[PDB]
Amino acid sequence: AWDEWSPWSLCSSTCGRGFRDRTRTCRCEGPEKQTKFCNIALCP
Numbered sequence: 001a002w003d004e005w006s007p008w009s010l011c012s013s014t015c016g017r018g019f020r021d022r023t024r025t026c027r028c029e030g031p032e033k034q035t036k037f038c039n040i041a042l043c044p
């Protein structure tokens with residue numbers, strides 16, 4: 001009843017803590033989003 005999750009997004013921050021998200025749609029109530037922590041670099 002679900003499409004595949006999208007790829008995880010880039011980190012919302014280019015340094016320091018941020019969020020990454022992905023989403024899936026029905027193809028089943030409605031769309032779903034998953035969110036996680038990310039940190040790709042220390043800020044200067």
Ligand SMILES: *[C@@H]1O[C@@H](C)[C@@H](O)[C@@H](O[C@@H]2O[C@H](CO)[C@@H](O)[C@H](O)[C@H]2O)[C@@H]1O
Nearest residue numbers: 012013014015016017018041042043044
């Ligand atoms: C993405 O690239 C990084 C290397 C930094 O230049 C980022 O800028 C910094 O972003 C943070 C918020 O994530 C701000 O607190 C700083 O002011 C800023 O230098 C950039 O967005």
Ligand SMILES: *[C@H]1O[C@H](CO)[C@@H](O)[C@H](O)[C@@H]1O
Nearest residue numbers: 002003004005006022024
């Ligand atoms: C998304 O989540 C996982 C892949 O990370 C699987 O359960 C499936 O592909 C779903 O669409």
Ligand SMILES: *[C@H]1O[C@H](CO)[C@@H](O)[C@H](O)[C@@H]1O
Nearest residue numbers: 005006007008009021022
């Ligand atoms: C999110 O997580 C895996 C593990 O890195 C990624 O490779 C993929 O893009 C998925 O969206």
